[PDB]
Design a protein around this ligand. Structure first.
Ligand SMILES: *[C@@H]1O[C@H](CO)[C@@H](O)[C@H](O)[C@H]1NC(C)=O
Ligand SMILES: *[C@@H]1O[C@H](CO)[C@@H](O)[C@H](O)[C@H]1NC(C)=O
Ligand SMILES: *[C@@H]1O[C@H](CO)[C@@H](O)[C@H](O)[C@H]1NC(C)=O
Ligand SMILES: *[C@@H]1O[C@H](CO)[C@@H](O)[C@H](O)[C@H]1NC(C)=O
Ligand SMILES: *[C@@H]1O[C@H](CO)[C@@H](O)[C@H](O)[C@H]1NC(C)=O
Ligand SMILES: *[C@@H]1O[C@H](CO)[C@@H](O)[C@H](O)[C@H]1NC(C)=O
Ligand SMILES: *[C@@H]1O[C@H](CO)[C@@H](O)[C@H](O)[C@H]1NC(C)=O
Ligand SMILES: *[C@@H]1O[C@H](CO)[C@@H](O)[C@H](O)[C@H]1NC(C)=O
Ligand SMILES: *[C@@H]1O[C@H](CO)[C@@H](O)[C@H](O)[C@H]1NC(C)=O
Ligand SMILES: *[C@@H]1O[C@H](CO)[C@@H](O)[C@H](O)[C@H]1NC(C)=O
Ligand SMILES: *[C@H]1O[C@H](CO)[C@@H](O)[C@H](O)[C@H]1NC(C)=O
Lengths: 172, 326, 321, 169, 319, 164
């Protein structure tokens, strides 16, 4: 807006990044826009897809036909059978609930760390050439157009190139 | 003043998940793994329609209670649908030995062929027309269609003696009964002698029943009782009947004609024109999910029933959007 | 020379937890989730006290064994407490058909009312005073209080024929027996005839028993046996007895007067004045924890029994001074 | 003098909460919890504990069952079932606890690490990162300023100036 | 320069995780036992009771074809064929048979005691037998049972008891012969309408022969319905019969107790040892799961329906 | 750590590679490696300390009149197998996820354990290595490995080399 770009991983999510799950927002003379990290997003989608299939590759092979019938002289037997059917439902119901609960905890942390990695993947490859703002964004000490923007996104950023004037701008 | 920023996706998802640490957490995407809906309809399983008894019970059907005449011949079945308390069972009051073991036998069989094994025309030294008002077909005393009530022919009940080699090439359910009259007068009226027996022999079966003549409450307006029994006659085995009175003999056996996977489900729903791999008393389940909570008493290839109201996996990000117009 | 430091809490907690990766790790706080203690006392459940049989057994009680006369009338019960091998069961030796099915029937019922359904005064063609030393009430031959031993009245046992329409408005347990004498002499002494029967009919029950007269070892100094049977007479249904000898007929039925949730637990502990939602043979459990390890054979709303000695969740920090 | 951070160990002297700060200036020294960080955790952990305890439970169930001497297979069947469930519950419980304790302790380690970075990021060149989980200021900071660093309202642009002059020797 | 890194090796071994599949790691621990020795073995030192073609009923009744089992030592568990050939040579049934069979999944040794010697039925012929129980061409009968029949036109009441003074609990078996017709019933026992009663302190049976025509099994129409009981120590068992009794000569004192089971297999015993035996072979393992065969006997890992369970212990192998 | 593993470090699990005038070589962190081996050993034993105490003797036999009973028994044996089989599979799956992350974080810690103790004396290359701004021989190398590194010592010339 209307309020000055800048939301990073810290501060929140971006509705404007319809592209993928994790990604970059940029700001230069040419303009501003959102862009997903295809690599980071994919590794996650795969991870999460697998997580979901893991829970769903299960047992399942029936037919089983659960209904059973008993005399009025076989109440202990009926009851036995009832405790069994109940016992299994109790187990499956508890494991399921807790499984879901633990795997949701893990999933969200998984996302938080993927995004943090994307941050450090950049931080490490820029260093003194850029100021770490602290909102999950980097202010450049030099200039960087779309040619250079690709380089920082897909990890081919030339630090030795912009090494020079980054220093001169930094020292005031 | 040039800038790069690293962030994550948000959307207008309203969907909440729980975690071990946190509750009602809005996320961008979620996968429900708990099947909650059914179609409301009673359906065919693996193409086959189920054997739908209406008001009849297995005993009514296999004995051939008159009110069950619509089931004198019925095709292959997916599973058996029975009412919880069917009206037409034993028209003539009695009991059925090892009934539930029999009922369980039909949760693997999926078709009978009813073979006439002991035609009634060949009891030529006995009256076979015996019947009663409890099994009345429009006003007139009748009896179980598949059974024969042997009684004295003009002041005599000679020993009744017939066998049957199971040459049907498949395994065969044979049923029979013994009549337990209400008093000595009735026992003579019908069988002339007193202190009688019904023996049944196969290679493995050896029963011998004596009628228990006792006074007892009128069920369906009758005091007598008929206690039925059953057996699987193996292929090429013989079954012998011998009786000096009180035999309710079979006319038919039931060759177990198709095998496979069925069950009995108790419900008052009528069959409809639909398909499933999983049927429940409330309706059928179309799902790929691992759990359902619809109804424990399923038949078919079903998800694991659980006693849970919600199981939702987060797949997406924690949905924490941008203050618009950002 | 001015400084800020970021750290975490520690305390004098000694409490250890285990993790997948690590063992005996001291933490600042922990929540035990495994209930380990019981009060030691046998208690009432949901306010009601349990039916406490002492040396009697269900069969002793329902037949009305004389040594169980303290149980001729007993109020509503939470659950049933029975000894593992009760002393007073079938005073007159015998058996009880479908006994455990009957016992199981009392793990849902919680009160009987004993209704006099076939008063003995009305067997006016038979002697009803039969009894024996095995059921002796202080030296004198007696018999099961709720049963009647029919025998010949002066050289005759006419057909014994009585019925009872269950008009009590609730479902009713009726029990009866057949006497299996030791020899033909005894069978005549008592019932005149030989080759006798006892039939019992309801709308759904149809039994007919013949006495098996055989020589056999003395149990409680007796060679005869009495085989008891039972049935639930449904409301408004009738039960007919017909016998030409060997009937041990009921005087009472047992209207199932209260329904609900009980069980039978085998223990020698006596009831005491306390309360629980969960009772075990060793004592009762007051807990909100999900697991216990006290005893598998609980009755009530209980945590899941496990075979574990400790389950402790870390809630606190790794306690490292 | 002073100094134990998250690295090095715990502070008995912080009876206040779970995670927090120790400070050292001209006025003095003292411990102080981060109410925000501590709370989020207490809540998390309380929930963890309730999750494990919201379960099944609804009996009466009355587990004792009785059998003839002619029903030993039936008795045995019933025993294998009761045993089978106990084996399952017992194993799941043990392992559940074990995995959730692993997770809990890591949870605490990362909360404290966050509290560290929440500060580090908001101070930068104004302070020297000692490496024991503490920051030595390159300028001066009294209790007014101490509140600001704790509750995240620290003025970097303020002390920006003299931090530099002190740093360059 | 200093650099921080991790170990890699030429490991090929793959594991799966919730997030990832077929991930190569440096080290892994399989926790799923997959192998057995192929051999049927002794459990806790003891060899199992190995019936060959005989069945428990053949053995305890003393079917002639089972004469190799007239005496057999203590046993770990019982090995039986799935459909043993020699059971009831004379066709019939065995009341509460599976309960009896289950009784031998805790007992581990019998001693066969002669409780009612046949020499003392001196008012009856004891030599009765038939071609269904033929020992090389000649009619015989179950070795441990005695077929009482009339001695020259008379079957007086047959009346014998036995106080169990063996000091241990004792299995006693008996039968009632159900002839094919009235002619046979008289040929053998004279009288018609007969009984066999058996009394102990807790047992009270009385059987009447059901004389009926029936299909020939083993070329015979009669049947013999066997029953059994545990005579408790110092208890007495009474037999009384006016015909149709198949009486025991022997009881079986339950001589050793413990832990056995019955496993159905055609494998022969061999000279090896285990704490866990299955129909395919035995399991030597410390792992918690196996997938060999559900029907084990002994202290075994939990059977699972799984083809692989492998824990990563090492690093992600990325060389 | 970034970029991959080292076959050349046969020594342990996590460790250092160094480069100075004397030479180059690999060296494990005995401390970091051990804590892990212990952790992982425990993980494996935790899963294996279980139930187990039979005899149990699973085979049971039933009449042709006890098919419901046989079936009951079958559904039980199947039910337990289904539970154990599912739990095992998922247990393994989750604990492998955890193990690999465990390694990644141990190695990351080893990185930060160094980074924090060096700071301006060294340039963080971004491939998980540190280029020194001063010089460091094997005496000094021990110090950085086992955490006794003297920052106040090489503090001086690190600065002079850094500023061009
Ligand atoms: C907002 O959500 C609605 C449904 O709740 C959906 O139809 C719509 O596509 C969403 N908006 C955007 C921009 O995706
Ligand atoms: C979460 O939401 C549901 C309804 O959507 C509500 O009933 C429940 O009380 C909430 N739970 C918590 C822990 O706030
Ligand atoms: C029944 O018939 C088959 C051939 O159909 C024959 O082999 C057999 O002898 C007969 N069985 C009996 C018991 O008579
Ligand atoms: C089941 O669901 C699928 C969803 O892909 C649908 O296409 C199919 O028609 C459904 N079957 C029935 C009977 O509704
Ligand atoms: C140890 O801690 C407890 C509080 O949990 C306290 O009561 C006790 O006095 C403490 N002792 C010391 C020396 O701090
Ligand atoms: C844990 O502590 C207990 C003492 O309570 C001890 O018996 C056990 O061996 C300990 N285990 C370890 C790994 O220290
Ligand atoms: C029993 O009594 C009721 C009336 O009190 C009557 O309706 C019913 O017909 C009687 N039942 C029988 C089985 O006689
Ligand atoms: C932050 O909030 C106020 C600032 O007005 C201060 O009084 C309080 O002590 C601070 N809290 C913490 C935890 O530092
Ligand atoms: C069995 O033997 C002993 C004699 O040694 C005797 O004391 C006991 O009473 C006998 N029991 C019976 C039932 O005969
Ligand atoms: C199992 O195998 C190991 C050697 O691999 C051996 O030491 C152990 O004694 C074996 N046990 C048996 C019962 O063969
Ligand atoms: C694989 O590692 C082995 C260690 O067993 C080592 O000897 C060898 O160098 C490796 N393979 C190759 C081709 O270097």
């Amino acid at each position: 807006g209307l309020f000055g770009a800048i939301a990073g991983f810290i501060e929140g999510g971006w509705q404007g990044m319809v592209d993928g799950w994790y990604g970059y927002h940029h700001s230069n003379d040419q303009g501003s826009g959102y862009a997903a990290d295809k690599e980071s997003t994919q590794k996650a989608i795969d991870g999460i897809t697998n997580k979901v299939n893991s829970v769903i590759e299960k047992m399942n092979t029936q037919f089983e036909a659960v209904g059973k019938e008993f005399n009025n002289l076989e109440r202990r037997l009926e009851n036995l059978n009832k405790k069994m059917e109940d016992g299994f439902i109790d187990v499956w119901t508890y494991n399921a609930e807790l499984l879901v609960l633990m795997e949701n905890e893990r999933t969200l942390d998984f996302h938080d760390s993927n995004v943090k990695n994307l941050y450090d993947k950049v931080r490490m490859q820029l260093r003194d050439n850029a100021k770490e703002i602290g909102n999950g964004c980097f202010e450049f000490y030099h200039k960087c157009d779309d040619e250079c923007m690709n380089s920082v996104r897909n990890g081919t950023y030339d630090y030795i190139k912009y090494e020079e004037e980054s220093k001169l701008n930094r020292n005031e | 003043s040039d800038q790069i920023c690293i962030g994550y996706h948000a959307n207008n998802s309203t969907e909440k998940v729980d975690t071990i640490l946190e509750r009602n957490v809005t996320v961008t995407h979620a996968k429900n793994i708990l099947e909650k809906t059914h179609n409301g309809k009673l359906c065919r399983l693996s193409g086959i329609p189920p054997l739908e008894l209406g008001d009849c019970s297995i005993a009514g059907w296999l004995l051939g209670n008159p009110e069950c005449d619509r089931l004198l011949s019925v095709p292959e079945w997916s599973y058996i649908v029975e009412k919880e308390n069917p009206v037409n069972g034993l028209c003539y009051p009695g009991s059925f030995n090892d009934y539930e073991e029999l009922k369980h036998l039909l949760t693997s069989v999926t078709h009978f062929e009813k073979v006439k094994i002991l035609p009634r025309d060949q009891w030529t030294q006995h009256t076979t027309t015996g019947g009663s008002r409890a099994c009345a077909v429009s006003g007139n005393p009748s009896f179980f269609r598949n059974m024969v009530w042997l009684t004295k022919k003009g002041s005599n009940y000679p020993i009744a003696k017939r066998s049957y080699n199971n040459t049907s090439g498949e395994q065969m359910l044979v049923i029979w009964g013994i009549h337990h009259p209400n008093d000595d007068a009735e026992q003579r009226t019908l069988y002339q002698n007193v202190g009688t027996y019904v023996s049944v022999g196969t290679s493995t079966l050896n029963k011998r029943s004596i009628p228990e003549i006792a006074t007892r409450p009128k069920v369906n307006g009758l005091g007598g009782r008929m206690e039925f029994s059953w057996t699987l006659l193996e292929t090429w085995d013989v079954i012998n009947f011998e009786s000096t009175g009180n035999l309710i003999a079979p006319e038919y056996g039931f060759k177990i004609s198709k095998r496979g996977s069925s069950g009995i489900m108790k419900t008052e729903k009528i069959l409809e024109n639909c398909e499933t791999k999983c049927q429940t008393p409330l309706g059928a389940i179309n799902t790929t999910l691992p759990f359902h909570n619809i109804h424990p008493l399923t038949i078919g290839e079903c998800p694991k029933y659980v006693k849970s109201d919600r199981l939702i996996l987060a797949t997406g990000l924690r949905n924490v959007p941008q203050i618009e117009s950002r």
